[PDB]
Amino acid sequence: GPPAVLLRLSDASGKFEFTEVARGLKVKRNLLDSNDVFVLYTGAEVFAWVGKHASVGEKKKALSFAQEYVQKAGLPIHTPVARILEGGENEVFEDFFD
Amino acid sequence: GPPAVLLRLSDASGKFEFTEVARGLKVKRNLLDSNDVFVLYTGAEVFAWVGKHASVGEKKKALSFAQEYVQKAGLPIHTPVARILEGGENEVFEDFFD
Numbered sequence: 534g535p536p537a538v539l540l541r542l543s544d545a546s547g548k549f550e551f552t553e554v555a556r557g558l559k560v561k562r563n564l565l566d567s568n569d570v571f572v573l574y575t576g577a578e579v580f581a582w583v584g585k586h587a588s589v590g591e592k593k594k595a596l597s598f599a600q601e602y603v604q605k606a607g608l609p610i611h612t613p614v615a616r617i618l619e620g621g622e623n624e625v626f627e628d629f630f631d
Numbered sequence: 632g633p634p635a636v637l638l639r640l641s642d643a644s645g646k647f648e649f650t651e652v653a654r655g656l657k658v659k660r661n662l663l664d665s666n667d668v669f670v671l672y673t674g675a676e677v678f679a680w681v682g683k684h685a686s687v688g689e690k691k692k693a694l695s696f697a698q699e700y701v702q703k704a705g706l707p708i709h710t711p712v713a714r715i716l717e718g719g720e721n722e723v724f725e726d727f728f729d
């Protein structure tokens with residue numbers, strides 16, 4: 534929906550880059566990249582989605598960057614934050630794109 | 632924070648009006664008028680706040696208008712929606728207002 538935001542976390546450059554890649558109706562499943570981590574804010578929760586081929590640093594820091602988004606976006610303190618793996622059942626995550 | 636939205640449900644005009652009255656950092660506790668119903672979207676959950684002096688119709692329809700807000704705002708279908716009374720104790724609602 535309109536409040537959604539999708540961000541990419543990548544250290545493929547040699548340093549971490551945490552960049553917004555889409556928001557609102559532009560948040561599409563086909564923007565996810567198995568090589569990186571993605572942070573998805575749905576309007577009700579924040580997901581740290583860990584691609585199968587994400588790096589050791591991306592995987593270790595996935596949750597801390599999702600937390601950084603929660604704080605800088607001004608989301609309320611009970612916002613659920615969940616770390617999920619690519620390919621998992623991830624029913625709540627998958628329902629966002631349903 | 633910035634994503635917060637506050638809407639007023641009132642039939643004081645002679646018919647039901649449901650309209651946004653504040654958003655972002657302007658969503659403040661002194662906007663909770665005991666005479667009406669207010670729907671608060673925090674960025675993660677929705678509350679139907681029921682003023683003690685709201686009308687019979689405002690109190691009956693409060694929750695339905697909060698649920699309809701989830702639909703019309705494009706929020707996840709499982710977004711928490713809770714009906715709460717003026718002066719009541721709700722941890723998440725109170726925490727949003729510090």
Ligand SMILES: [Ca+2]
Nearest residue numbers: 568569587588
């Ligand atoms: Ca990577």
Ligand SMILES: [Ca+2]
Nearest residue numbers: 666667685686
């Ligand atoms: Ca009233």
